Amino acid sequence: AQNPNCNIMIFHPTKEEFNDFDKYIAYMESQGAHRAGLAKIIPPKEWKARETYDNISEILIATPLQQVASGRAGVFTQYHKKKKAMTVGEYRHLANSKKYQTPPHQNFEDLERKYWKNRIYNSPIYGADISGSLFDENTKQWNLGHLGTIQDLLEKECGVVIEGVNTPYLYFGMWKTTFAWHTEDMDLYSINYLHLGEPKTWYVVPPEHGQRLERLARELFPGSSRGCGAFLRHKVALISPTVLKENGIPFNRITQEAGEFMVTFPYGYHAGFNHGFNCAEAINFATPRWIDYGKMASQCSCGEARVTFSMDAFVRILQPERYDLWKRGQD
Numbered sequence: 001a002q003n004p005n006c007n008i009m010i011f012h013p014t015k016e017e018f019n020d021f022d023k024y025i026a027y028m029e030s031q032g033a034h035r036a037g038l039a040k041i042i043p044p045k046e047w048k049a050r051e052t053y054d055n056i057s058e059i060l061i062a063t064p065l066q067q068v069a070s071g072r073a074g075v076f077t078q079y080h081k082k083k084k085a086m087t088v089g090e091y092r093h094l095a096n097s098k099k100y101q102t103p104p105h106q107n108f109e110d111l112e113r114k115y116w117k118n119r120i121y122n123s124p125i126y127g128a129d130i131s132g133s134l135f136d137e138n139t140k141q142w143n144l145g146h147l148g149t150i151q152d153l154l155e156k157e158c159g160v161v162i163e164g165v166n167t168p169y170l171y172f173g174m175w176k177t178t179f180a181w182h183t184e185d186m187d188l189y190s191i192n193y194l195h196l197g198e199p200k201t202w203y204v205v206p207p208e209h210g211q212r213l214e215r216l217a218r219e220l221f222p223g224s225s226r227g228c229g230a231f232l233r234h235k236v237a238l239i240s241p242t243v244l245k246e247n248g249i250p251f252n253r254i255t256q257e258a259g260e261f262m263v264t265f266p267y268g269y270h271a272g273f274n275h276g277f278n279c280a281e282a283i284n285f286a287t288p289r290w291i292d293y294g295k296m297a298s299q300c301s302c303g304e305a306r307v308t309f310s311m312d313a314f315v316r317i318l319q320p321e322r323y324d325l326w327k328r329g330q331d
């Protein structure tokens, strides 16, 4: 069995290997990359996502989210307070202000220590989940706006034609902006490209150990667990590496820098934080190996998780027994 310790693997495809996206994902899996839940892909030196980032300041962040924490430094939830719209140029200036800028630090490990010590005492503002793309239309390799759609994959594997679309999302971050512990909708893959700016630190639990993280989460967030049998679908809970180590939960960590891709694998729980002003683009995708994970994915039916239009068909076809309850949660 390849990668039996579930380490995060890093790949350096050649320009030739970068042509066929599906083939390269299958290659990485042949080497055991999925066992970690997360992989890094460094593009060949010849490749670029677009020519420059000099003309992005007029993109609108219609609903910036202030991420307000509650709890203790290693075990907290966050809620998202909506703020007034602002442009990317306005947001960049805010991220670089004395109130929000990255503190002086020695290295990534020092900054990680400062994040876990101090995150809860601040409320950073995240421009998340913005439909759009920064890939040039002429970029033919690993262009996250030109991937095969999940609807087409389900149709190819299972024969059923379904409604829905699959487009990318932009994330504009600042110091301390945080992504809570989650797997993807319907335990899909994700791919994330860091277009510009400061790094993003990731934490990940191997898919084969995901239920250990869920059991810890029910212990640490006991009111939330009574409210919903899949409350990590709410995407609000944080648990630090120190707390994970104290409770024996298997995990790994890695820092993504600008110009790098990360892939999350089905049922790979992940969480993380941004080091400073940055912009990422991410999208969900599927492969044949996903189908079995989609059929077994948990679902939030309490009303909190509220998701895209396109998840309807995935539930309806892969999980017909759960469909009626889940749809009630959507309405």
Ligand SMILES: O=C(O)CNC(=O)C(=O)O
Residues within 6 Å of the ligand: 171, 178, 179, 190, 191, 192, 264, 270, 280, 282, 283
């Ligand atoms: O970058 C972020 O804030 C969160 N991204 C992801 O969870 C991802 O790409 O799957």
Ligand SMILES: [Mg+2]
Residues within 6 Å of the ligand: 055, 056, 057, 058, 059
């Ligand atoms: Mg612009």
Ligand code: NI
Residues within 6 Å of the ligand: 182, 183, 184, 190, 264, 270
């Ligand atoms: Ni994710």
Ligand SMILES: [Zn+2]
Residues within 6 Å of the ligand: 227, 228, 229, 230, 231, 233, 234, 300, 301, 302, 303, 304, 305
């Ligand atoms: Zn719920």
